[PDB]
Structures are given as C-alpha cells and as structure tokens.
Amino acid sequence: MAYSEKVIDHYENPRNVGSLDKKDSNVGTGMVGAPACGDVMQLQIKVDDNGIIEDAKFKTYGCGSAIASSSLITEWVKGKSLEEAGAIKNSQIAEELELPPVKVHCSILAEDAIKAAIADYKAKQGLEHHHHHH
C-alpha cells in the first residue's frame, strides 16, 4: 500500500498535468453577494507554488466601487498562504481603508469571499462522488 515514507496523492493531478480549470483541488472558488440590496462579488485564489498562493483573480460586476477593495484584498493574499487567508478579518481592510459604517457591505464581501474560496478549496476532497453512469 506504500513501501515508501510518502503518502502524498500526487505531485499535481492524475489528469496528466492541467492546473487552472475551475475544477481542481489546487484552485479554491468563492462566489458571494449581498442579497440585501443587489451586489455580486466573485473571488478565486490559486494555490500551487507549494501550497502557497501565486495568482489571485477576481470578478465583481454590480457595485461601481467595490472594485477598489477587490484589488487590495486580491493583492493582499497574492503571495500569502491559505493558512493566512483563513485568518484575516474584514476589520483588517475596514481599518486600512477607513470607511463609514454605511458601506461595510464591501469589507464584508471581502472576508466572506475568502471564506467561500477556502470552503470550496477543502470540499474539493471530502466525500467526492460515488456514482456517475457514463
């Protein structure tokens, strides 16, 4: 079952190289929004440089402004690790930006987003599937 001291499942993926596909365990996806008004935010982080984050894309089309922060949060994890992304809080950016309590909808979609990417990043390897007639 493993005459070696390595249990790793594989260096990359059993699909003969690939990376980038919205359908991999090395890519966390997160799509949230604010149904309390009508704002949609999408954030996706990439992890491969050794469990580290090398690239961090995103997409927020609906709030003409929630983009700025999108560039700050995405540029804050770009290089960090999931262990760090799963710890930052919305108060962190809320303070670095200094904005009134009448727009927290952003800082919220920021941290809440990273939470979705981490949830879908760890769920891509839980119960998986069991049946799938071809």
Taking alpha carbons only, the member of 121, 117, 97 closest to residue 107 is 97
List binding-site positions for Zn(2+): 37, 63, 105-106
What is the four-CA torsion angle of 63, 68, 73, 79, rounded to 10 degrees?
A: 130
The rounded distance, in Å, linking the Cα atoms of 77 and 80 is 5
Q: In this structure, are residues 129 and 119 in contact, taking their beta carbons and an 8 Å threshold?
A: no
Residue 92 corresponds to which amino acid? Q
Q: Does domain 1-134 have CATH number 3.10.28.10?
A: no
> Which residues belong to the active site?
37, 106
- 51: phi then psi, degrees, rounded to nearest 5: 65, 0
Give the contacts of 41 (CB within 8 A, at least 6 positions apart): 31, 32, 33, 34, 58, 60, 62, 63, 66, 70, 109, 113
Q: How many CA atoms lie within 13 A of 73 on its CB side?
A: 34
Tokens 């003409």 locate to 64
Domain residue spans of the chain: 1-134
Give the contacts of 45 (CB within 8 A, at least 6 positions apart): 27, 28, 30, 53, 55, 56, 77, 82, 85, 114, 117, 121
Three-class SS state of 26: coil
Detail the DSSP E strand segments found in 52-94: 53-59
List binding-site positions: 37, 63, 105-106
Give the contacts of 51 (CB within 8 A, at least 6 positions apart): 81, 82
Detail the DSSP E strand segments found in 1-134: 27-34, 39-47, 53-59
Give the contacts of 39 (CB within 8 A, at least 6 positions apart): 33, 62, 63, 66, 105, 109
Residue 81 DSSP one-character state: B
What is the radius of gyration, based on Cα positions, of the chain?
17
